[PDB]
Write a protein that binds this ligand. Structure first.
Ligand code: GLU
Ligand code: MG
Ligand code: ZN
Ligand code: ZN
Length: 1176
């Protein structure tokens, strides 16, 4: 129980290993006495083997106190110890006949089948007693006696031939005697023809019954001559005949004991050398069969494991506490299915012993051995072969495999995790008065949650004498504890989560505030991160306990520290839906307002000027000023626009200096919410304009400033939403359109008096309908804005901008990329990827592809002057600065080109989308990238899975194999594209292409035509290109650019914003594997590039995420991913040892994940105060 182990390794469990584990053999299929309800001796639940029912007490009772421990009872045989051992101790069942492990027989592929070269349909007929198998043959005696046996065989065969000829003539002779009478007696052509045709029918049987015996006798001799080990005999009458005579020359058996015999005399190395040959042409499946099966043959040779482990002579028994039988509520009994499945085995194993001792015939005995074989099969994996064992109501019993996979109805692959203590949930309500770092917590929920904490401080003071008394003081809600509750709650963070959890911002930390009521008060800004609508939703609360857990909540998971979405980089706490409309109304400008500014005339001076922003407030309170007016005032504590600041001062900022501008009072009050250092804006706040502002605020200021700024925008946005005057009624909604559409409809009706005959034209018809429909839509669009002033509530809201299957893909995305973490600051690789970056005469995809990147090379202008230098954050100010220089393309580091041996590096990955700074070392990007792609799952999802699984496109598209010109040939059968190479070599033609698979689109633009030039990477037709095709054409690095290109294009069609680096992390894991061609080492197992490249013929290989995730280093992580059965068998044979490298393994065993705070450099930190501060 050291909690730290290096390796976890498996292997086939021999019958001796099973006998070593067991504390005894369970001999009876008994569970518990029906009267005493106590464990029956020598059966299941027997205390003499598994363990005592009660702590430190034996069965008979002669040893009860703890004084006797580590001893056994002489009368009952129960070791006196804790009752927990019932859960840790196993039994075993000694089998009267060997039995095969169903995992190595019915597996796909069949391990025994590939080991002994037995077809799965032939192997099933042996262990289930459907055929005989030759175990051994004596060569010397057969060769020495072959002479005499051939003589006796031909003599017996001749004696039958002599009998056939003798019996036929005698009977055929008698047929002539009957016809002699029929000539003299009744003579007709049809009276004798029947018996004549009958006589021929009678004779035809005589020939065939004698002939069929010659074949039967020929079959015995030819089988004896070519008889050899491993041969099969399904006749069983030939076999008995084969054993009646020549019975001493050979031997044979059935069932698992015969399979056990072949392994006994079997040479792995001698069977390996035969499989080592790649000659014997084997251009097709003949050699690959020997190569594919060699994986199971060479696996036994390398290690010391004996293949005998596949046939069990003993079966282990799972401890009783894991297969319990306990009395239910209301007196009913309950028990696991394993007890009945174990009972099935021990019942037949015992009856087999009775049959053997009875000298029963082999039919009964071999039938019982087959039934014994099927019980162990059902015990391990029920229903894998034949119909499963069904209990009451015809429900399949749950075997051990169902237990291990976690199959309840169909599958629950640990996605339920496990329930935790110190948790709770309730319904959530709006918390508009809360700070971003706060959350409203019901007093009762916080009381029960912190119950151990308040009990301590309550005992520290004299309110309760001892801890037992304080428990009743908290449980009965004595009013003395509420003052104590606020102390233990203060500065003690809690975690909030709303299911489903899509991205990491679905779990955040807050500062708990004691709140009246039973609901949870949630901050209105985190709703978008939680996707929490306020209609009957609930959220769960978890209380961190350890100092490390509290630190991770206050630093990593704090609500105010997580603002930017860690997918695109945009802020998620930006105001929305009311604070947008509230701020839109405050900053909007209306001419002719009550306090409108008026220029000075000869009679009176300017009336719109105010001494300070404070006066305008006093004017706003009176009926003199409207907040939306155009007044111009003087501002001191507010800084001016940067365009006008240089003209006005140019001598520095103005903390106390004054200046004058023409704005609205609302725009003044709005800019006071922003930081003092931020310049003036003076615009009506759109939804895009506010997002534009929050973005620039996040970069130039620490997030605390951005957190409190958005918090100030919430108060004003909510405050002015009420004063906004937004209300709905009949007028603002009710549909004009009646008379409009009643008129347009008659035009389409009269078109039938034309389409019938005279004026159809067959294309003016469709064109007339489309034009008239769009014309009505154009008139409807005008009527939509013709009936409402721009201040209409619905219109105002629109203007401001206020208004399940995916989980499958996400889990595979997480399964393949969960191990991808940043492990080093810089790998110092010199080669990245080119970014398009601003077509001009401005690419909208630069924010996803070019933004938050790091330059691999310097950005050089044609004039010679260098601008943003390599290794730079490539911020948005740098893009605009680069755009001014007029440069098209830039080269940028990427994780696709990262040369890091382990994971990726910080420099190649770049800026963290959430932090806005360089990504930290501990960061685990693979999971963040998987969630970033999975959440939008809610031309679509089925296409996205096609790409990540690297399957063949639904409609294949041609790619140019070489560069040159193109010859377009159009035929009815299919299009024809022939590429004339610039080299002058053999032409490349692309034939039989469906005509509906339209041609690809191209200073002069257009669509591809005859004679165009095409480079190596151009796609010839519209559609999807085979990712395996481009792999061998352009190379592995161009594949990753192509994959991300198509994946990004799908999510862009729906309006989703995901940075390319997230997709690039998933695509990085596909090409990591290379296929070793052949032999130095051996065949094309999908290996690792670095492991192969860093040590000394192979290929680059593209493969799906599901196939890639199963190829990872650890086996018990791949076992939890897909089809635990196949993974475990291979991992058992090769004795694969799991080094616990990945984080999934540590989660399974409860270790600290090797990511974030679990990294060795971070968790080994030593903390000691400076001697300068110690002495003070
Ligand atoms: N084994 C540590 C290594 C951390 C490091 O030094 O980067 C974790 O995982
Ligand atoms: Mg809801
Ligand atoms: Zn006893
Ligand atoms: Zn790198």
């Amino acid at each position: 129980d050291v909690n730290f182990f290096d390796e976890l390794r498996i292997g086939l469990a021999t019958a001796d290993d099973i006998r070593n584990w067991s504390y005894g053999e369970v001999k009876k299929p008994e569970t518990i006495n029906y009267r005493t309800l106590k464990p029956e001796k020598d059966g299941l639940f027997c205390e003499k083997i598994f363990g005592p029912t009660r702590d430190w007490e034996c069965y008979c009772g002669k040893y009860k106190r703890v004084r006797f421990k580590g001893i056994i009872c002489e009368r009952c045989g129960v070791e006196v110890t804790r009752a927990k051992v019932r859960r840790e101790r196993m039994g075993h069942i000694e089998l009267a006949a060997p039995v095969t492990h169903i995992w190595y027989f019915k597996g796909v592929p069949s391990r025994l089948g590939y080991l002994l070269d037995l077809a799965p349909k032939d192997l099933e007929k042996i262990i289930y007693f459907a055929a005989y198998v030759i175990t051994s043959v004596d060569d010397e005696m057969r060769h020495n006696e072959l002479s005499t046996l051939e003589a006796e065989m031909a003599v017996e065969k001749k004696a039958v031939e002599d009998q056939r000829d003798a019996d036929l003539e005698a009977r055929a002779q008698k047929l002539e005697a009957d016809l002699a009478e029929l000539e003299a007696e009744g003579a007709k052509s049809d009276v004798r023809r029947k018996v004549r045709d009958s006589g021929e029918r009678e004779m035809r049987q005589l020939r065939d019954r004698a002939q069929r015996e010659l074949d039967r006798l020929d079959e015995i001799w030819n089988t004896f001559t070519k008889l050899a080990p491993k041969q099969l005999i399904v006749d069983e009458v030939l076999y008995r005949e084969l054993q009646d005579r020549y019975g001493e020359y050979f031997t044979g058996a059935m069932g698992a004991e015969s399979i056990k015999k072949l392994i006994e005399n079997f040479d792995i190395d001698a069977e390996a050398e035969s499989l080592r040959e790649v000659i014997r042409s084997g251009k097709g499946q003949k050699k690959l069969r020997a190569l594919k099966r060699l994986k199971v043959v060479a696996a036994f040779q390398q290690s010391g494991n004996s293949p005998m482990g596949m046939v069990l002579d003993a079966v282990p028994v799972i401890p009783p506490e894991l297969r319990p039988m306990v009395q239910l509520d209301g007196g009913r009994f309950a028990t696991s299915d394993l007890n009945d499945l174990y009972r099935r085995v021990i019942n037949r194993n015992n009856r087999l012993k009775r049959l053997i001792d009875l000298g029963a015939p082999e039919i009964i005995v071999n039938n019982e051995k087959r039934m014994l074989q099927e019980s162990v099969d059902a015990l391990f994996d029920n229903g894998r072969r034949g119909r499963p064992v069904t209990g009451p109501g015809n429900r399949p019993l749950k075997s051990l495999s169902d237990l291990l996979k976690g199959k309840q109805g169909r599958f629950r692959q640990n996605l339920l995790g496990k329930r935790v203590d110190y948790s709770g949930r309730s319904v959530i309500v709006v918390g508009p008065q809360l700070k971003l770092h706060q959350c409203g917590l019901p007093k009762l929920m916080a009381l029960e949650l912190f119950k151990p904490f308040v009990m301590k401080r309550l005992v520290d003071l004299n309110h309760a004498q001892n801890i037992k008394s304080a428990k009743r003081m908290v449980e009965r809600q004595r009013p003395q504890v509420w003052d104590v509750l606020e102390e233990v709650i203060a500065e003690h963070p809690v975690l909030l989560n709303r299911a489903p959890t899509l991205h990491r911002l679905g779990i955040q930390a807050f500062e708990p505030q004691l709140v009246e009521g039973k609901a949870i008060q949630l901050h209105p800004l985190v709703c978008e991160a939680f996707n929490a609508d306020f209609d009957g939703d609930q959220m769960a609360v978890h209380l961190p306990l350890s100092a490390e857990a509290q630190a991770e909540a206050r630093i990593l998971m704090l609500s105010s520290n997580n603002i930017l979405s860690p997918a695109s980089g945009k802020p998620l706490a930006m105001p929305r839906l009311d604070m947008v409309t509230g701020l839109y109304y405050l900053t909007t400008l209306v001419e002719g307002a009550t306090g409108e500014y008026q220029a000075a005339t000869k009679d009176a001076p300017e009336q719109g000027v105010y001494s300070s922003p404070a006066e305008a407030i006093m004017a706003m309170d009176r009926g003199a000023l409207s907040v939306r007016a155009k007044i111009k005032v003087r501002l001191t504590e507010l800084r001016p626009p940067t365009d006008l600041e240089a003209q006005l001062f140019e001598n520095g900022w103005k903390p106390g200096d004054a200046w004058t501008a023409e704005t609205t009072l609302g725009r003044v009050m709005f800019n006071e919410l922003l930081p003092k250092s931020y310049p003036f804006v003076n615009e009506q706040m759109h939804k895009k304009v506010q997002a534009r502002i929050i973005n620039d605020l996040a970069e130039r200021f620490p997030m605390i400033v951005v957190a409190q700024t958005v918090d100030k925008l919430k108060d004003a946005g909510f405050y002015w939403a009420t004063r906004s005057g937004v209300t709905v009624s009949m007028a603002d909604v009710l549909v004009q359109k009646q008379e409009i559409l009643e008129r347009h409809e008659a035009e389409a009706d009269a078109i039938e008096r034309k389409y019938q005959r005279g004026a159809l034209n067959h294309t003016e018809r469709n064109e007339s309908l489309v034009k008239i429909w769009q014309d009505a839509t154009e008139e409807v669009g005008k009527a939509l804005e013709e009936f409402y002033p721009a201040d209409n509530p619905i219109i105002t809201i629109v203007k401001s901008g206020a208004t399940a299957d995916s989980g499958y893909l996400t889990r595979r995305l997480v399964d393949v990329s969960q191990d991808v973490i940043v492990r080093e600051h810089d790998c110092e690789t010199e080669r990245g990827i080119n970014v398009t970056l601003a077509e001009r005469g401005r690419d909208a995809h630069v924010e996803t592809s070019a933004f938050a990147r790091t330059l691999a090379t310097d950005a050089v202008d044609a004039n010679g002057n260098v601008i943003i230098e390599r290794g730079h954050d490539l911020g948005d100010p740098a893009i605009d600065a680069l755009l001014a220089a007029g440069i098209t393309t830039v080269k940028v580091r990427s994780v696709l080109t990262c040369t890091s041996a382990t994971g990726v590096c910080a420099m190649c990955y770049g800026r963290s989308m959430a932090t806005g700074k360089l990504v930290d070392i501990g960061e685990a990007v693979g999971i963040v990238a998987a969630q970033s792609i999975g959440e939008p799952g809610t031309g679509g999802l089925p296409r996205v899975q096609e790409l990540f699984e690297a399957r063949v496109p639904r409609n294949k598209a041609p790619i140019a194999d070489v560069a040159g010109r193109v010859r377009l040939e159009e035929s009815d059968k299919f299009f024809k594209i022939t590429i004339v190479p610039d080299d002058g070599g053999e032409e490349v033609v692309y034939d039989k292409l469906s005509k509906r698979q339209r041609l690809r689109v191209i200073g002069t633009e257009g669509v591809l035509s005859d004679g165009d030039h095409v480079e190596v990477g151009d796609q010839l037709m519209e559609g999807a290109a085979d990712p395996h095709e481009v792999l061998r054409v352009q190379g592995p690095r161009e594949v990753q650019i192509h994959l991300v290109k198509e994946v990004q294009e799908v999510y862009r069609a729906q309006g989703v914003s995901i940075h390319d680096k997230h997709i690039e992390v998933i695509v990085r894991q596909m090409l990591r594997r290379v296929t070793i061609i052949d032999s130095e080492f051996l065949p094309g197992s999908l290996t690792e590039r670095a492991e192969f490249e860093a040590e000394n013929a192979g290929r680059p290989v593209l493969m799906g995420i599901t196939k890639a995730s199963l190829a990872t280093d650890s086996w018990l992580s791949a076992a939890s991913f897909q089809e635990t059965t196949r993974v475990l068998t291979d991992a058992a044979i090769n004795c694969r040892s799991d080094k616990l490298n990945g984080l999934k393994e540590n989660v399974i065993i409860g270790k600290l994940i090797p990511a974030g705070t679990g990294i060795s450099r971070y968790r080994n930190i030593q903390v000691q105060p400076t001697e300068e501060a110690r002495a003070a």
